[PDB]
Design a protein around this ligand. Structure first.
Ligand SMILES: CC(C)C[C@H](NC(=O)NCc1ccccc1)C(=O)N[C@@H](C(=O)NO)c1ccccc1
Ligand SMILES: [Mg+2]
Ligand SMILES: [Mg+2]
Ligand SMILES: [Mg+2]
Ligand SMILES: [Zn+2]
Length: 890
């Protein structure tokens, strides 16, 4: 396989200054005429001129109006167009091509494609070469003049990046529009849209310079009323970047467009952000609550790229985390500020420690700046995004808000209108660090290891207290396991945000402080500590590490109850659960392997259960926090701590633990489920798509979490509550009624009822499909066949395919059926899907990532399916690279 290496980066021998496009859309073909105004760079050594160009049909090629001919002056192999150096001018020249492409058959949703009745592009990472020839890499920055023509009745709205400078009629019922983007950009930020779109709009006045910006949000006609919240989220995003970072929008207009068929969430094309409809469109009558947080996140994320990715872009793709990690971090500050609930930060931690930690202990493990790739599309990972964001967040923790803003400003100003690397960011942060320490000898050279070193660090603690001296010490060790990226791992710069809790009264003993661990180990000593404390470690989750707190369950309970930091309270709970899960797992596993007729299980700690009740019954504690404490840790978090995992034993372990706790707390759960009703389901703002109460949404989350626990328990008469819940005006409630009815005979009537409520809204149907897919049903395989035949059918909509299959793959008991039938089903879907959408096919591989963590029979079954997929003729390069890496062949 053809491998690109980070160390091999070289600037091009060519420059592309201006791109002038005519994109002429017809029913059965699109013709793209492109003039590239080019030049020879200072790095040129008289090499061939090689363009990327994939699946293009050439009508004509010229340089300076001299026609070039295949086999004489160029060769084209369906991937690369090579102009022989003899015909490459030695100074400024115009390269002209005309090619034919076919959006109407492009089911891979990269390049130019048709999504229902909208023509749309996706160019990041290597999609522009599917539209026309280019030197298709992010340091080739240029300015774009883009004309789009089409049938006016079918395609009345035409959009491309930047200022619309002309609109005109064309004979035969056609029309055109011309766009000029005055900002230099890489080709991955090119976009075009054509469709029968409707919009909402507003005007936004920038804060410092008072520039008037027209904001448009677009969709198909049917769903125009689902655009309001997105528009409001955009205004919120613009205000945040002004308020926190001082950054203003830089064009007269910004368009957001929803399309039904999209590989990911959204895309930051300059002035023309394109979204998966599931991450732009919502209405309160037709969407679950989580759609509102999702849209707020994705709109924000794309908006924040306008600086972190667009105005300062990437030198090369190995720098991806510089824009994605930093944009995730920006979006997280934005979301925490807009929601003002502790669950926003916890949800990010939850995601990282489950999905990203599993990735980092898998054969796919990579540093946030990879050393190599085959398909760049495989490096759009939770490691690059989520670990990346935590690395970018550590700078804020180390510097504090004031100096963080200073360093960010240095970065954004110095590199504006240009490419940048991860070193450029670290250098800006180092400047701020020197100012903060007041010491121009301070440096962040060590910090670079967060970019280059793979794996999750393990941080462990030992404590000592001397009562006579009133002096307390925290001794800290860090360890990262050797792996295929580094056989010797080096110590990182780990910022450890700490407090100290007095166990006797539950109060804070020190001003909060950040310990700067830079060695393999260090001891931090505190004076005037008046009683032996309980340490509150890694507040806010201050570095992306495995924490070994070395606390007893008695100490962890006291943090759970009395600590100020939501993360440490939640982590203390997590650790109590993990200790219990590991113990019970081992007990069940030994009894299974030894074929025992009888054995013991270690009960759940009774003081812990009491602490859960005390928290739940506290009217002034947070509803969102509560839903986290009654839930066990996610399965992917749990698996990071077990080798040779028997999934069936783990499923038995979880059930025992949940049952122990419910046998004590179910009456409390029921009483809270009833008492939360009035506030949770209050209809204030139910007609206001500009405002969401995130606290109230957390109350609904908690009710629905409680209802699941009570349903699984068969609590007396709970079916009655389930039927009532099915009449709620909130889809979050009435789809939960479906999910929780799985434990009762009523399941098929609620399946019909909710289907009928969901079936006329494309996105609500997809949420229904997920609700069915993750239903705790013994007959789930027969239900999936019914979905396939009655609803999914032959859809190529990635959202439909992902809705049916991915929730099911999280069913620990059924997906990991010891027959292998779960593995076989998902592998067939992957292979089926790979024949038209390689990106989506790789996304569907995600359940296989943990294969080498499983018991040996399940390893063998998964491995057999992976090798079967690898033997598929014409397997994409995406899927092949992914599977070869995952199976330790690459
Ligand atoms: C916008 C973001 C909140 C959602 C999503 N993120 C990921 O795909 N994250 C990586 C990941 C996370 C979890 C599991 C697996 C992967 C996504 O749509 N990414 C885009 C992107 O970065 N748009 O700016 C984008 C644009 C272009 C190509 C890819 C992705
Ligand atoms: Mg083609
Ligand atoms: Mg404002
Ligand atoms: Mg559809
Ligand atoms: Zn992004």
């Amino acid at each position: 396989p053809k491998i690109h290496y980070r160390k091999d980066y070289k600037p091009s021998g060519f420059i592309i200054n201006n791109v002038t496009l005519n994109i002429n859309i017809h029913d059965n073909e699109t013709i793209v005429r492109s003039v590239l105004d080019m030049d020879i760079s200072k790095h040129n050594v008289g090499e061939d001129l090689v363009f990327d160009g994939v699946g293009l049909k050439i009508n004509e090629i010229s340089i300076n109006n001299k026609k070039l001919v295949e086999g004489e002056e160029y060769t084209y192999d369906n991937e690369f167009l090579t102009i022989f150096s003899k015909f490459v001018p030695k100074s400024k020249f115009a390269f002209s091509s005309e090619v034919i492409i076919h959006p109407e058959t492009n089911y891979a949703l990269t390049g130019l494609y048709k999504s229902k009745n909208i023509i749309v592009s996706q160019c990041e990472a290597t999609g522009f070469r599917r539209i026309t020839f280019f030197i298709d890499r992010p340091d080739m920055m240029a300015k774009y003049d883009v004309t789009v023509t089409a049938d006016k009745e079918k395609y009345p709205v035409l959009l491309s990046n930047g200022d619309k400078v002309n609109e005109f009629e064309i004979p035969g019922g056609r029309h055109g529009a011309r766009f000029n983007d005055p900002h230099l950009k890489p080709c991955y930020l090119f976009a075009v849209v054509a469709g029968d779109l409707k919009h909402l709009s507003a005007t936004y006045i920038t804060k410092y310079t008072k520039k008037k910006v027209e904001l448009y949000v677009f969709s198909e006609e049917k769903y125009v009323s689902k655009l309001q919240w997105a528009l409001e989220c955009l205004k919120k995003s613009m205000a945040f970047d002004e308020d926190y970072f001082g950054l203003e929008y830089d064009l007269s207009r910004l368009n957001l467009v929803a399309v039904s068929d999209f590989n990911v969430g959204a895309m930051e094309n300059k002035g023309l952000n394109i979204f998966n409809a599931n991450s732009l469109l919502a209405s309160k009558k037709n969407s679950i609550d989580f759609s509102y947080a999702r849209i707020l996140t994705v709109v924000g994320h794309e908006y924040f790229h306008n600086y972190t990715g667009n105005r300062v872009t990437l030198r090369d793709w190995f720098q991806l985390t510089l824009k994605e990690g930093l944009t995730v971090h920006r979006e997280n500050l934005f979301s925490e500020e807009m929601t003002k609930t502790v669950t926003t930060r916890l949800s990010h931690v939850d995601l990282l420690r489950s999905v990203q930690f599993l990735e980092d202990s898998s054969p796919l493990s990579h540093p946030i700046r990879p050393e190599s790739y085959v398909s760049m599309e495989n490096f759009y990972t939770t490691t690059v995004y989520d670990k990346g964001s935590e690395v970018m967040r550590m700078y804020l923790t180390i510097l504090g808000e004031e100096y963080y803003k200073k360093g960010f400003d240095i970065y954004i100003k110095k590199n504006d209108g240009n490419t940048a690397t991860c070193e450029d960011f670290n250098y800006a942060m180092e400047q701020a660090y020197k100012m903060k320490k007041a010491d121009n000898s301070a440096n962040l050279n060590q910090y670079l290891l967060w970019f280059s070193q793979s794996g999750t660090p393990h941080v462990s603690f030992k404590y000592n207290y001397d009562a006579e001296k009133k002096q307390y010490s925290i001794h800290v060790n860090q360890y990262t396991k050797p792996d295929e990226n580094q056989k010797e791992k080096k110590p990182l710069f780990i910022p450890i945000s700490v407090g100290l809790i007095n166990p006797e009264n539950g109060k804070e003993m020190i001003s909060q402080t950040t310990l700067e661990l830079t060695k393999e180990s260090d001891t931090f000593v505190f004076n005037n500590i008046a009683v032996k404390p309980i340490p509150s470690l890694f507040r806010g989750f201050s570095a992306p590490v495995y924490i070994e707190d070395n606390l007893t369950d008695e100490e962890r309970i006291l943090l759970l109850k009395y600590d100020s930091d939501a993360f440490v309270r939640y982590n203390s709970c997590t650790n109590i659960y993990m200790k219990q899960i590991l113990m019970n797992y081992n007990e069940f596993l030994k009894a299974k392997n030894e074929k025992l007729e009888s054995f013991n299980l270690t009960p759940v700690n009774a003081q812990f259960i009491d602490a859960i009740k005390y928290l739940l019954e506290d009217p002034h504690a947070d509803a969102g926090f509560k839903s986290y404490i009654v839930s066990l840790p996610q399965d992917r978090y749990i698996i990071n701590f077990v080798s040779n995992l028997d999934t069936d034993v783990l499923a038995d372990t979880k059930e025992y633990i949940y049952k122990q706790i419910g046998d004590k707390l179910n009456d409390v759960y029921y009483k809270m489920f009833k008492s939360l009703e009035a506030k949770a389901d209050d209809l204030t703002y139910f007609n206001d798509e500009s405002h969401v109460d995130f606290d109230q949404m957390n109350m609904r989350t908690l009710r629905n979490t409680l209802l699941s626990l009570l349903s699984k328990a068969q609590y007396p008469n709970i079916l009655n509550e389930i039927i009532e819940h099915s009449k709620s005006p909130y889809p979050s409630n009435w789809l939960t009624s479906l999910s929780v009815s799985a434990y009762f005979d009523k399941y098929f009537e609620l399946y019909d009822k909710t289907y009928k409520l969901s079936k006329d809204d494309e996105l609500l149907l997809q949420e229904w499909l997920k609700t069915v897919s993750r239903s705790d049903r013994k007959d789930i395989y027969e239900i999936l066949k019914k979905l396939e035949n009655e609803v999914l059918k032959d859809s190529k909509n990635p959202n439909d395919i992902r809705a049916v299959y991915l929730p099911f793959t999280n069913n620990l008991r059924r997906f990991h059926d010891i027959s292998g039938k779960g593995y076989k089903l998902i592998a067939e879907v992957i292979t089926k899907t790979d024949k038209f959408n390689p990106m989506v096919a790789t996304q569907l591989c995600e359940p296989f990532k943990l294969w080498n963590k499983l018991d040996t029979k399940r390893q063998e079954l998964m491995l057999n399916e992976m090798n079967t997929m690898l033997q598929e003729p014409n397997i994409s390069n995406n899927l092949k690279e992914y599977l070869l890496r995952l199976t330790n062949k690459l």
